[PDB]
Amino acid sequence: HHSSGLVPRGSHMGSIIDAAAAAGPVVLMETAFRKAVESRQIPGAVIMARDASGNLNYTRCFGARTVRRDENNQLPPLQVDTPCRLASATKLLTTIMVLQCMERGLVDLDETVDRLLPDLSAMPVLEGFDDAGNARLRERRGKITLRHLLTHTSGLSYVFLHPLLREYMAQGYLQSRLAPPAVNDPGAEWIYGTNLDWAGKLVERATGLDLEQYLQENICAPLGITDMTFKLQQRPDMLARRADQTHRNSADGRLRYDDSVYFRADGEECFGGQGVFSSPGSYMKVLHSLLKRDGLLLQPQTVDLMFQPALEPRLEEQMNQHMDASPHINYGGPMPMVLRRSFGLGGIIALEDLDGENWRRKGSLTFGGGPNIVWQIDPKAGLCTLAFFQLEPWNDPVCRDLTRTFEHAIYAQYQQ
Numbered sequence: 001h002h003s004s005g006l007v008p009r010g011s012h013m014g015s016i017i018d019a020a021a022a023a024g025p026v027v028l029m030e031t032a033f034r035k036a037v038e039s040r041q042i043p044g045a046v047i048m049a050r051d052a053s054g055n056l057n058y059t060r061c062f063g064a065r066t067v068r069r070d071e072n073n074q075l076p077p078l079q080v081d082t083p084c085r086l087a088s089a090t091k092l093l094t095t096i097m098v099l100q101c102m103e104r105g106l107v108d109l110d111e112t113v114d115r116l117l118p119d120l121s122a123m124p125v126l127e128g129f130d131d132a133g134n135a136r137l138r139e140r141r142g143k144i145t146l147r148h149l150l151t152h153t154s155g156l157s158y159v160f161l162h163p164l165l166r167e168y169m170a171q172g173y174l175q176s177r178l179a180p181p182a183v184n185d186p187g188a189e190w191i192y193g194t195n196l197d198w199a200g201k202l203v204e205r206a207t208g209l210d211l212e213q214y215l216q217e218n219i220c221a222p223l224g225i226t227d228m229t230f231k232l233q234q235r236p237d238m239l240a241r242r243a244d245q246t247h248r249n250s251a252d253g254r255l256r257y258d259d260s261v262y263f264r265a266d267g268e269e270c271f272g273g274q275g276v277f278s279s280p281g282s283y284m285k286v287l288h289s290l291l292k293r294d295g296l297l298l299q300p301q302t303v304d305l306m307f308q309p310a311l312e313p314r315l316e317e318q319m320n321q322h323m324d325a326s327p328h329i330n331y332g333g334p335m336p337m338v339l340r341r342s343f344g345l346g347g348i349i350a351l352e353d354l355d356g357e358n359w360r361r362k363g364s365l366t367f368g369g370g371p372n373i374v375w376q377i378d379p380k381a382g383l384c385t386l387a388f389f390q391l392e393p394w395n396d397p398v399c400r401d402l403t404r405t406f407e408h409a410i411y412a413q414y415q416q
Contacts (some may be wrong), residue, residue, distance in 0.1 A: 025409035030060060032405055037063035041398050043246045043255055044078035046280040046388040049410045050288045056383070056414045059281070065390065066244035067255050080281040081227055083242040084390055085262060087274045089369030093219060093286065094196040094272035095150055095346035097203045097211070099302050100218055106206040109150070112143035113198070116205045119178070120144065120198050125155060126164050126181040135173060141185040146202065148186045149195040150345045151310045155182035156193035161329070177271060190311065190319035190343060192331065200272020211270035222296045223289060227279040230270040232263070238277065243390040245371060258392055280388040283375070287384040291377055307365050307379065309342035309349055316342050330395045332366065333374040334404040359411050372399035381415045
């Protein structure tokens with residue numbers, strides 16, 4: 001029956017099991033994350049989801065911020081306030097900074113870059129190599145605009161992603177992030193490149209501030225953020241709490257400490273393409289503000305611009321062909337390998353629902369950062385999410401599958 005003065009509860013095995021409701025999608029998903037840490041498949045992860053109303057405010061942290069044991073022989077935890085390497089997840093931040101410049105009348109999105117970036121405008125385009133093996137450089141056809149930089153349609157490419165630039169370096173021409181030539185004319189094709197390093201310079205020259213100061217005054221201060229910087233070396237408090245980078249060795253699949261240059265040398269320039277260190281918590285504050293249309297970073301109408309397909313049909317088609325054919329690069333992370341996409345300002349836009357009413361909707365904006373960081377904002381679902389790992393290389397199957405599982409679970413329980 002029931003014990004006097006005691007709350008009625010399960011008193012035998014059948015009634016105890018039934019008194020506990022079965023595990024929903026989110027609980028099962030958290031178990032998968034815990035098992036991945038337990039079995040040493042990942043170092044750790046922070047996953048976060050918010051809606052606009054405040055009824056969804058979900059943050060879970062799993063595992064360690066490193067594989068190196070600390071002074072007490074332990075593996076310290078990855079936390080919501082742990083300083084993490086954002087790498088290309090910096091690009092959303094720089095895009096916002098550019099758009100603020102536009103809002104304040106310092107720049108027009110369709111103005112040529114020649115005025116503020118004459119060093120960019122003077123750069124030639126690498127057409128190829130002659131029979132001898134000499135670089136064939138020529139003058140650009142048309143002008144690069146600010147909007148070309150923001151949409152990666154300027155003709156600029158990262159060296160390692162283009163065969164012309166790889167051979168350009170192989171023949172000793174590059175002996176600098178800004179040095180290599182363009183590989184096409186502006187408007188010709190979508191090409192992932194150093195566009196936000198250039199856009200960052202444009203912000204510095206338009207405002208007379210370095211990007212760090214601009215960042216602090218215009219993104220961090222308005223959101224109460226104190227864990228986001230280009231200058232990690234000058235923040236000893238952040239430096240001591242920071243994540244180490246981990247690398248998965250392609251042979252045995254084991255996790256190893258990754259001793260790479262971005263943690264010892266700040267470098268003197270602020271690079272708008274990859275330079276920011278931020279906690280997951282602070283990055284979510286940016287995403288959430290954009291979701292809320294709260295005017296703290298940008299006017300609602302300007303945020304709406306970021307989610308509009310920027311590409312005319314020819315470029316949309318070319319980008320989708322390139323992305324569908326490039327799952328080895330996989331810009332979209334957990335998104336389906338084949339999907340109709342466009343590019344907005346700040347990321348890739350889904351032009352169709354990912355899985356009907358079960359997952360991200362048409363109009364959602366997304367991108368990633370190198371060490372398996374994935375962010376997305378989905379105005380129709382009323383959700384934004386991030387999955388922060390500190391594990392290289394990009395597109396790690398375990399991280400991608402865990403990230404999918406996370407998003408699926410959150411959408412299944414909390415999408416509205």
